Amino acid sequence: QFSSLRTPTGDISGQNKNNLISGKATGRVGNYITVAVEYQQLEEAIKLNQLEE
C-alpha cells in the first residue's frame, strides 16, 4: 500500500518517500486427529461378529 504527498509545486526533496515493507501470512501443520481402539483376541473369537459395521 502507498501514501501520497500534497505539495504546491510538487518538489519532494525535503521529505520521505514510500518505503517497501513486505509482510507474509504463515500456514502451519496442526496436531493429529486420532481415534484408536483395542480388543482382546478372546473377544474377537466369541463376541465380535460384524466388526466391519
Binding site: 483376541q41 474377537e44 473369537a45 466369541i46
Partner: protein, 53 residues
C-alpha cells in the same frame, strides 16, 4: 421328587429335615479315583481362533 409332575422323579421319596447322611471314604486320605461313564456324560470341544493383524 415332584408331586405335580411325578414323571420326573429320580429317587424314591422326599428328603426331609433330619435325614441321616454320611461321607464316602476316610478323612484326609489321598487316592486316585477310577471313572465309569456313558459316552454322553460329558462333552468336549475347541473354539477356532482368528489371526492377529
Amino acid at each position: 421328587y415332584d408331586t405335580t409332575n411325578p414323571q420326573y422323579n429320580s429317587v424314591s421319596r422326599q428328603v426331609e429335615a433330619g435325614d441321616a447322611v454320611s461321607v464316602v471314604g476316610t478323612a484326609s486320605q489321598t487316592m486316585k479315583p477310577n471313572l465309569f461313564y456313558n459316552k454322553f456324560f460329558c462333552g468336549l470341544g475347541s473354539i477356532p481362533l482368528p489371526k492377529l493383524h
